[PDB]
Amino acid sequence: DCSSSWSSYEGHCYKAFKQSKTWADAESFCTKQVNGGHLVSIESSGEADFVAHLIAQKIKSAKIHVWIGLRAQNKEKQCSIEWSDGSSISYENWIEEESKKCLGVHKATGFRKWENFYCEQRDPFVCEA
Amino acid sequence: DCPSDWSSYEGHCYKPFNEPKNWADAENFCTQQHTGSHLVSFQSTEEADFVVKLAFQTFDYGIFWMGLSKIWNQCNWQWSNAAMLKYTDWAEESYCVYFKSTNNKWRSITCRMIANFVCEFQA
Ligand SMILES: [Ca+2]
Ligand SMILES: [Ca+2]
């Protein structure tokens, strides 16, 4: 059973929101909507279909993407260890928006393929409980 | 002190190529151009400015690979709900770093993309 306006699939309740927020804010927002809420996690094909269709119902734009609950924990800009020449990384010149450690799905792939995005972008999302 | 077709800077030798290759092929290519040659690496801003000025002056505007690949493949990817990661649907497998001959800022792009590049080795 799910709260009014939430949809269910395999014992879980899902909900798409049009309001745009950063990845961290969406996650935080989802925790406050329902106990145990988080950004959706996709653990199978079946769930991928359900979620893709769920999203497609409310989100019609391609100007933005939809946040999903997968993200790189590391605080560094990259996780490898060295350059191809073997030397270590001891100087970076990254463009903030260029480090894409949060994932989202876009309309162009039918909201299925996981694409990398800069975590601070404001975008719609989906909560799962 | 570098071969005539290469440019020097602080004991190093650099050379830009405009043969469109993906990251893996680019690196491998650089290794057979000279001993100890690899895709360029940046240890400072002065060096980066140097290579940029060099790449632009030679082939004008374009994108050039840097010696960094699979930058997030080893990161700790996790579901915020603590679900274990088994199912997968990555749009792109690996991401590599490149820079525009216009400025020295590091940029991201899938490693299977085709771009130009700069090779380097210790003189
Ligand atoms: Ca799930
Ligand atoms: Ca170097």
Curated annotation (Swiss-Prot), chain A:
Chief location category: secreted
Self-association and partners: Heterodimer of subunits A and B; disulfide-linked.
Binding-site residues for Ca(2+), renumbered to this chain: 41, 43, 47, 128
Record carries keyword Metal-binding: yes
Disulphide bridges, residue numbers: 2-13, 30-127, 102-119
Keywords, ordered alphabetically: Blood coagulation cascade inhibiting toxin, Calcium, Disulfide bond, Hemostasis impairing toxin, Metal-binding, Platelet aggregation inhibiting toxin, Secreted, Signal, Toxin
Protein's cellular compartments: Secreted
GO molecular function, one term: metal ion binding
Name the UniProt record assigns to this protein: Snaclec anticoagulant protein subunit A
Parent-protein start and end of this portion: 24 to 152 of 152
Function statement: Anticoagulant protein which binds to the gamma-carboxyglutamic acid-domain regions of factors IX and factor X in the presence of calcium with a 1 to 1 stoichiometry. Also inhibits platelet aggregation by binding to platelet glycoprotein Ibalpha (GP1BA) and functioning as a blocker of vWF. Is devoid of hemorrhagic and lethal activities. Possesses antithrombotic and thrombolytic activities. Also hydrolyzes the Aalpha-chain of fibrinogen. Does not affect the Bbeta-chain and the gamma chain.
One cellular component (GO) term of this entry: extracellular region
Tissues showing expression: Expressed by the venom gland.
Curated annotation (Swiss-Prot), chain B:
Localisation per UniProt entry: Secreted
CC per GO annotation: extracellular region
Tagged with keyword Signal: yes
GO MF annotation list: metal ion binding; toxin activity
UniProt tissue specificity: Expressed by the venom gland.
Purpose: Anticoagulant protein which binds to the gamma-carboxyglutamic acid-domain regions of factors IX and factor X in the presence of calcium with a 1 to 1 stoichiometry. Also inhibits platelet aggregation by binding to platelet glycoprotein Ibalpha (GP1BA) and functioning as a blocker of vWF. Is devoid of hemorrhagic and lethal activities. Possesses antithrombotic and thrombolytic activities. Also hydrolyzes the Aalpha-chain of fibrinogen. Does not affect the Bbeta-chain and the gamma chain.
Name of this chain's protein: Snaclec anticoagulant protein subunit B
